[PDB]
Amino acid sequence: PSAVEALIETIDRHGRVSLNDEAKMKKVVRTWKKLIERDDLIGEIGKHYFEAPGPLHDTYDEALATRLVTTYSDRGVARAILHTRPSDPLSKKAGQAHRLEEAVASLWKGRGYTSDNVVSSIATGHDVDFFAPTAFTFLVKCVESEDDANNAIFEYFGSNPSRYFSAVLHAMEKPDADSRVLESSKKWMFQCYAQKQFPTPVFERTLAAYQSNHYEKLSLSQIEELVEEYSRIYS
């Protein structure tokens, strides 16, 4: 058959077959890549799923996002979004990918997800992955403000500045890391300890106490970077 009919029947079969978690995490990416291959697929399938019986939506993209999230779980959709980022943002593939990602973000907002639900859905297991740009931008999309996204990541680490700083330092090494945003997160942590009127030089011993899932235990307590910088940025 054609591409639209084949992809629709694939999505329906996957939805009703009640497949394994690893099977869904593997098939969501294949379906997702099939979706963004050409620019006349998202619209046509969205229009088809809009008219089909069920709940009523406001857009076609919302209908497609609802069906995708229902078939492959909230974590499967996030997995497909993070691992299917095309290279050139001005291409047709990138446009379709952004359409799908924004539809899913609005879907999650419409269900009253908090920052913690979104972070736990994106969560992959490695604490460094939350600061990769392809995940940080989606998180900011879902929470609407970088401060709230940073707070959500900080709380997901058990409110532990040691783990947070280790993750940010590891994200510094990343090749395509938007260093401005990484310094924005580091500056946010410094600030949230700063205006608190907690300008004690003991920030060193607070970090030492908060340090020893599991993570790289920064032994590099950055007595200047993570201390002298706090020393002369404020007070």
Binding site: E51, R111, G112, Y113, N117, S121, R180
Partner: protein, 616 residues
């Protein structure tokens, strides 16, 4: 060419004082490993060997002083790609006469050049993610330029005044230049092909007009301070035009309707947009047309009738909207989405083939006698008003009702209402009882009724969803009916423990042991499950819940099949102290005891706690 792929393993070749250093047209480096300076002899810094294709992949916080010595001394540098440049400015010795491409996709530059240099044959300049850039050079004498991709340059305060002379520009990506406050006039022959200004939170002014004969995309998706929009002269082949969240936009260019091939128009969030232009109807093939939260949009132009291809007309929260156009018949309209339009005050009669008519929150208060001439409505939703009894032609077509907060009693004539498939009560703070509902009912969303103690019905639709969130006042015969109504969908109820009717209770977890009531003389068996959720932080708005079900036998090991095998509802609420029930269907099991493991998809939103079942 065949690139000299090397990672710190070409730097030894350049130390040789022989002519072997010369005759290297292309150099390709990868400096992921950190080092301040490449181990190069000072004698090789004197040699003036030239490079034409330079492709260097830099490293953060590693300013290679010597690598800049050998590279930029090359006179004929045709191409240049230095990711993570890590220097304040390009060296003053650079000769860019023959430059054809430039690409510094991550950088710490602050101004490229001191003075107006020669860019006669520059054709590409990508400076993306140069967050520390302060100003572009004097882009005059850059006539042959084609693309200028300044994506995500946060600190770029202003574009050069000499942009008018880029008579060959095709692409100008200024995606998230959050500090740019003015877009200079472009010129009479540039003919931009992609004008991308997506997230310019501080952009104010725009060119008075731009040539648009060859224009396909024009994105302003969060420009919150764009006062007006440049005139789009021809736009014969626009493909994309979205002005999402563009508040402060007062009007629209009157030439927007010249785009005769545009097929989707999105103005969601465009607050303070007073009126659409009268040329909107000139658009052909315009299929999807979004408006949402468009406050101050007081009228919708009557030129719409020319569209002939419109399919979806979304209009939510259009508070100031007063009068839709009359005496039109949109041939191919499919859904008219008019929700929360407070000041509508008049029925929407603009088509005859509408299939989804959503009219909730509108102060309509009448229904015309002309609807029997319309095509059958698959979804006609109107918020209930008291003076609805006078319209017997509106009762048999209606599909969804919605009682308001200040409803003293649901009218007894709802039973006459034939094709009703839902009845949503929204915090009916002064109610007592619910009458008999029509048997076509398939949804009952009693959201937060403070007092709904009595239910006086017997639902007989096999697929009905009796959701009663936060509806505490309920006599036990009502709670018995909600739980024991035979439906193949969910059912909500406020509760604190799984009731006693579900005998085979089990602790908080996913392991239920039940025993067959007898030797299974009936082949099939029917189970009614009950489920609470683990107490955990719950958002006041959590609205999605799905469940997986797996049945395995322990006396004999075999994964017995289950017929429903999952329940999913995207409208149900997720609340802690609430009881969720559903139905189960099984084969003829040769065993005598079975194990039910009620898991839940999306373990990161809600987990199943106490859950006991029963056999019918």
């Amino acid at each position: 060419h065949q690139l000299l792929v090397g990672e710190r393993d070409i730097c030894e070749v350049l130390n040789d004082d022989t002519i072997d250093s010369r005759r290297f047209i292309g150099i390709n480096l990868d400096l992921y490993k950190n080092v301040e300076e490449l181990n190069i002899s000072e004698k090789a810094l004197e040699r003036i060997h030239d490079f034409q294709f330079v492709r260097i992949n830099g490293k953060n916080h590693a300013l290679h002083e010597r690598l800049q010595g050998l590279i930029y001394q090359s006179p004929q540098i045709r191409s240049l790609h230095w990711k993570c440049y890590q220097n304040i400015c390009l060296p003053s010795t650079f000769n860019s006469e023959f430059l054809v491409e430039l690409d510094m996709s991550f950088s710490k530059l602050q101004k490229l050049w001191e003075g107006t240099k020669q860019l006669r044959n520059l054709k590409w300049m990508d400076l993306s993610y140069s967050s520390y850039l302060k100003e572009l050079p004097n882009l005059s004498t850059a006539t042959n330029l084609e693309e200028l991709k300044l994506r995500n340059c946060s600190s770029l305060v202003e574009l050069p005044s000499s942009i008018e002379k880029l008579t060959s520009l095709q692409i100008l990506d200024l995606h998230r230049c959050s500090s740019l406050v003015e877009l200079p006039s472009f010129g009479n022959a540039t003919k931009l092909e992609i004008l991308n200004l997506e997230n310019c939170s501080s952009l104010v002014k725009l060119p008075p007009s731009i040539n648009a004969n060859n224009l396909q995309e024009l994105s302003l998706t969060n420009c919150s301070r764009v006062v007006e929009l440049p005139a789009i002269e021809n736009a014969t082949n626009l493909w994309k035009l979205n002005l999402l969240n563009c508040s402060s936009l007062i009007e629209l260019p009157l030439s927007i309707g010249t785009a005769t091939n545009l097929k989707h128009l999105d103005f969601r969030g465009c607050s303070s947009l007073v009126k659409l232009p009268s040329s909107i109807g000139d658009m052909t093939n315009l299929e999807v047309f979004y408006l949402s939260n468009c406050s101050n949009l007081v009228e919708l132009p009557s030129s719409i009738g020319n569209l002939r291809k419109l399919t979806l007309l979304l209009m939510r929260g259009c508070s100031k909207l007063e009068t839709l156009p009359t005496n039109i018949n949109l041939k191919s309209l499919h859904t008219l989405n008019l929700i929360d339009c407070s000041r509508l005050k008049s029925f929407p009669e603009i088509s005859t083939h509408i299939k989804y008519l959503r009219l909730i929150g509108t102060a309509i208060k009448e229904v015309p006698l002309s609807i029997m001439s319309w095509s059958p409505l698959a979804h006609f939703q109107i918020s209930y008003f008291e003076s609805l009894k006078e319209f017997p032609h509106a009762l048999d077509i209606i599909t969804e009702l919605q009682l308001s907060k200040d409803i003293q009693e649901v009218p007894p004539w709802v039973k006459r209402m034939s094709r009703l498939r839902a009845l949503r009560l929204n915090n009916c703070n002064n109610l007592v009882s619910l009458p008999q509902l029509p048997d076509s009912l398939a949804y009952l969303y009693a959201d937060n009724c403070k007092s709904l103690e009595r239910l006086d019905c017997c639902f007989n639709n096999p697929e009905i969803r009796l959701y009663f969130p936060k509806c505490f006042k309920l006599n036990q015969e009502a709670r018995d009916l909600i739980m024991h109504t035979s439906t193949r969908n969910f059912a909500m109820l406020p509760g604190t423990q799984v009731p006693a009717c579900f005998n085979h209770r089990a602790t908080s977890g996913d392991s239920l042991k039940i025993k067959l009531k007898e030797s299974p003389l009936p082949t099939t068996l029917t189970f009614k499950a009950c489920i609470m959720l683990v107490n955990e932080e719950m958002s006041y708005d959590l609205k999605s819940m799905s469940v997986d079900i797996v049945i395995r036998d322990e006396q004999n090991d075999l994964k017995v099949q289950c017929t429903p095998s999952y329940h999913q509802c995207t409208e149900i609420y997720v609340l802690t102290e609430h009881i969720y029930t559903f139905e189960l269907e099984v084969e003829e099991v040769t065993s005598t005891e079975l194990v039910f493991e009620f898991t839940s998809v999306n373990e990161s939103i809600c987990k199943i706690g106490e859950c006991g079942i029963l056999q019918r």
